[PDB]
Amino acid sequence: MSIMEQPLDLTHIVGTEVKPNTPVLMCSVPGYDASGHVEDLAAEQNTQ
Amino acid sequence: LKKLFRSLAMTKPDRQLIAQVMLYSQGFRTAEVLANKIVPFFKLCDEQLSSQSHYDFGLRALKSVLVSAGNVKRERIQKIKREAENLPEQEILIQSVCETMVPKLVAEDIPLLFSLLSDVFPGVQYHRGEMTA
Amino acid sequence: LRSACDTVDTWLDDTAKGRQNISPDKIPWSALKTLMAQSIYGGRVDNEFDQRLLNTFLERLFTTRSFDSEFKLACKVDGHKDIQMPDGIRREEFVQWVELLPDTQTPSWLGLPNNAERVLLTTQGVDMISKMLKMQMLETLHTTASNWLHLIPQTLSHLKRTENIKDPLFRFFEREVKMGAKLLQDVRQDLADVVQVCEGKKKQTNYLRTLINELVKGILPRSWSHYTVPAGMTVIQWVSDFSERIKQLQNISLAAASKELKNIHVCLGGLFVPEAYITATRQYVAQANSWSLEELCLEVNVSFGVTGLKLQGATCNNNKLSLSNAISTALPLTQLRWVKQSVVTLPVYLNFTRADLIFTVDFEIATKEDPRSFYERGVAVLCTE
Amino acid sequence: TEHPKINEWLTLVEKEMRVTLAKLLAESVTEVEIFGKATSIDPNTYITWIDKYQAQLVVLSAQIAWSENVETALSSAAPLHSVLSNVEVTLNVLADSVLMEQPPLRRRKLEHLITELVHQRDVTRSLIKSKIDNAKSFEWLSQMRFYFDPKQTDVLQQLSIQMANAKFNYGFEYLGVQDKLVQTPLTD
Amino acid sequence: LYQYSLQFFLDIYHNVLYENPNLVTDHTQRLSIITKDLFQVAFNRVARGMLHQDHITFAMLLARIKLKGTGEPTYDAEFQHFLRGNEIVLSAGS
Amino acid sequence: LSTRDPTVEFPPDLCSRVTFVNFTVTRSSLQSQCLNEVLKAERPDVDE
């Protein structure tokens, strides 16, 4: 369970594990939001 | 949406500083003494009276009392001119306090208000009438 | 975090223009610390004590003793442990220090007592036991209600209604007894009605049916919830506290009937509104000394005696605060005196939730410990517990 | 009389309102400089200046002059005490004036100035209580600061209002008199 | 909050069996490598979308699964006493 | 009539009207699928 303490490899997961027809559910507790994380990921991957 | 705004808490305003300089601006010789007497009076009657749902002894009530005190001091000055020198500033403040706070009280809280007024200001008396027409 | 980093970048851009390194004194330490103590991190802070805690954290951490080497960021354990600040000057070195840090942490890392984590860990163990039991499992009533109904009300018999004095304390005590008697009369009428409809010839009404349903569920009715309800307590816990408050009010009324009202050692937890009592005794001192209400300050030692005060993470010893790992300890008797004009200033809350601050008390400091350490450990005084 | 469009001449009215307020503010700042540079002040010309210029303009020009004097004092101890003495002398003149009977418009215009000068007095007292290195000290950068540069040809963007690493151009919207707020530490 | 599907489990099959790292080429050791990788990847993928409170519960369940699969004698009575014996009824006046 | 959500509530009238056929997954079927898939991954010609 040492992998869980590291931050998410979101680019690897969305490039390999995630099928195109399966949505990526970015659940969060109140006080947290991952939309900025996805925007940063898109900026890294140069995707519109 | 919360990330697009910068938050800041507004919990308790400085009622002493709010009252003192505006009494100074309206023009009062004992402005600091009146300010030091009126804010603790409001804080004390906010809880020593009965807990009615229509009671409000906050900043809006205090500011309305101070504005009314300035207005009635100007009215007294105009009445003297019709008839600046020294004026009963404490009596003016008590007149504004009575005219703003007395009508909201229940029947068992008016003597309590007058006891608080006598405790804070010794020379209080009362002003009423003058509505013959 | 992003706003703080942007402010740091803006301040460094304003200070230096392309310089490779800056001296620690030329860094706007006070500017950055005040700016993110008042606007960035202190914006959402509601309490003055939380603001003081944030201020002392920022003041201890971000002065760094002007980038002093081997700076003590914190203590890992209160006894024989430390965290050393890394001397690297690069993101790679800081990241390496981060993974070099040990995985298992303790609440003493935060300047907190270690006993705050014990209840949470026990609750988490019970919860995971219950979850494993859940997966393993996957792999009349009104007579008992009437029995409890007949079991409760014997602790309450009567209360006076309560009568024309100008004392600042007497009228407050009288109105306290007044709404206490009103609530007690309403409770007695409800109990008599439900007794009549459960054992007798009386049909069910809507209000009494809702009372039956809510009392069987175990939630306090909103009608009985006049004063503060701590974090949604249960009815069996609330009824005993309500009985003790009634007993205190009965003692107050008996002593007033026989001023003698000053000699009563009132419990602050038994009062419906506690702060009104403190302001009432402030006005009593003011009218006794012919002084002003605002100028009277607090000097509390362990001429008005209060009881039922519990601390949090410290103990009292001849008006001296000593840190202890115990959760709480009880003050037998506490007296308050009013005088117009390093020390520690503790907050006093009604309950353990600390959702409503009542008033603050200034004590005397210990010889060995640091006021920042007191604030980080978070010593307070509780009443209704 | 040339029959322009309603929106066109309304836009002209708005823009030239802003430019007129900027010009009047420039003349007002010149007058406050030539008045409050000295220690003693003359109420007989103080009343005429206040009756001449608008309430927002007199309050803002007092703020501009006080900020400029404190900036000059910090550029260079004793000049800070000179600024405090000027503030207290103006406060005494203000107190005497509100003790006299006055029309309501000038009474409000004068009460606003009393409030602003009391706030300036408090800032000066706290700043003297603290220690100053230069104009880059945060104890001075934490307050609202006003700067005037008459050399600029763009009179609309001539006034600059500055907080700690914050720069603002005055919008020059006509606010009339309105109600001025008391600057508490919570307000700061 | 976490509902998992047989399609999800088949996806983790397609992501473990096909793209297994270090593709030992021996039918004996590849079985153990596939087994260990399947347990670890299952824990990782399930724990991506569940709370840190329940992370340890899922890990202990996977430890129970590994004990059942292994040869190792599972202490069924001790496991049942750890699970349900915490709420067992005790003797009167004990 | 077909559905993909097993955690759906049907009204009693529709329950009376229709015959329910639930396609749940069983341990034996899951083990058979797992054995077939590990055969295809390890020995594809043998599986065919």
From Swiss-Prot, chain C:
The modification N6-acetyllysine is found at K72. It comes from the Eukaryota. It is found in: Cytoplasm, Cytoskeleton. It is linked to Charcot-Marie-Tooth disease, axonal, type 2O: An axonal form of Charcot-Marie-Tooth disease, a disorder of the peripheral nervous system, characterized by progressive weakness and atrophy, initially of the peroneal muscles and later of the distal muscles of the arms. Charcot-Marie-Tooth disease is classified in two main groups on the basis of electrophysiologic properties and histopathology: primary peripheral demyelinating neuropathies (designated CMT1 when they are dominantly inherited) and primary peripheral axonal neuropathies (CMT2). Cortical dysplasia, complex, with other brain malformations 13: An autosomal dominant disorder characterized by global developmental delay with impaired intellectual development. Some patients show signs of peripheral neuropathy, such as abnormal gait and hyporeflexia. CDCBM13 is associated with variable neuronal migration defects resulting in cortical malformations. Homodimer. The cytoplasmic dynein 1 complex consists of two catalytic heavy chains (HCs) and a number of non-catalytic subunits presented by intermediate chains (ICs), light intermediate chains (LICs) and light chains (LCs); the composition seems to vary in respect to the IC, LIC and LC composition. The heavy chain homodimer serves as a scaffold for the probable homodimeric assembly of the respective non-catalytic subunits. The ICs and LICs bind directly to the HC dimer and dynein LCs assemble on the IC dimer. Interacts with DYNC1LI1; DYNC1LI1 and DYNC1LI2 bind mutually exclusive to DYNC1H1. Belongs to the dynein heavy chain family. Cytoplasmic dynein 1 acts as a motor for the intracellular retrograde motility of vesicles and organelles along microtubules. Dynein has ATPase activity; the force-producing power stroke is thought to occur on release of ADP. Plays a role in mitotic spindle assembly and metaphase plate congression. Dynein heavy chains probably consist of an N-terminal stem (which binds cargo and interacts with other dynein components), and the head or motor domain. The motor contains six tandemly-linked AAA domains in the head, which form a ring. A stalk-like structure (formed by two of the coiled coil domains) protrudes between AAA 4 and AAA 5 and terminates in a microtubule-binding site. A seventh domain may also contribute to this ring; it is not clear whether the N-terminus or the C-terminus forms this extra domain. This is Cytoplasmic dynein 1 heavy chain 1. It comes from Homo sapiens. The lineage of its organism: Eukaryota, Metazoa, Chordata, Craniata, Vertebrata.
Curated annotation (Swiss-Prot), chain D:
It is linked to Charcot-Marie-Tooth disease, axonal, type 2O: An axonal form of Charcot-Marie-Tooth disease, a disorder of the peripheral nervous system, characterized by progressive weakness and atrophy, initially of the peroneal muscles and later of the distal muscles of the arms. Charcot-Marie-Tooth disease is classified in two main groups on the basis of electrophysiologic properties and histopathology: primary peripheral demyelinating neuropathies (designated CMT1 when they are dominantly inherited) and primary peripheral axonal neuropathies (CMT2). This is Cytoplasmic dynein 1 heavy chain 1. Dynein heavy chains probably consist of an N-terminal stem (which binds cargo and interacts with other dynein components), and the head or motor domain. The motor contains six tandemly-linked AAA domains in the head, which form a ring. A stalk-like structure (formed by two of the coiled coil domains) protrudes between AAA 4 and AAA 5 and terminates in a microtubule-binding site. A seventh domain may also contribute to this ring; it is not clear whether the N-terminus or the C-terminus forms this extra domain. Homodimer. The cytoplasmic dynein 1 complex consists of two catalytic heavy chains (HCs) and a number of non-catalytic subunits presented by intermediate chains (ICs), light intermediate chains (LICs) and light chains (LCs); the composition seems to vary in respect to the IC, LIC and LC composition. The heavy chain homodimer serves as a scaffold for the probable homodimeric assembly of the respective non-catalytic subunits. The ICs and LICs bind directly to the HC dimer and dynein LCs assemble on the IC dimer. Interacts with DYNC1LI1; DYNC1LI1 and DYNC1LI2 bind mutually exclusive to DYNC1H1. It is found in: Cytoplasm, Cytoskeleton. Belongs to the dynein heavy chain family. The chain holds residues 1693 to 1886 of 4646 of the full protein. Cytoplasmic dynein 1 acts as a motor for the intracellular retrograde motility of vesicles and organelles along microtubules. Dynein has ATPase activity; the force-producing power stroke is thought to occur on release of ADP. Plays a role in mitotic spindle assembly and metaphase plate congression.
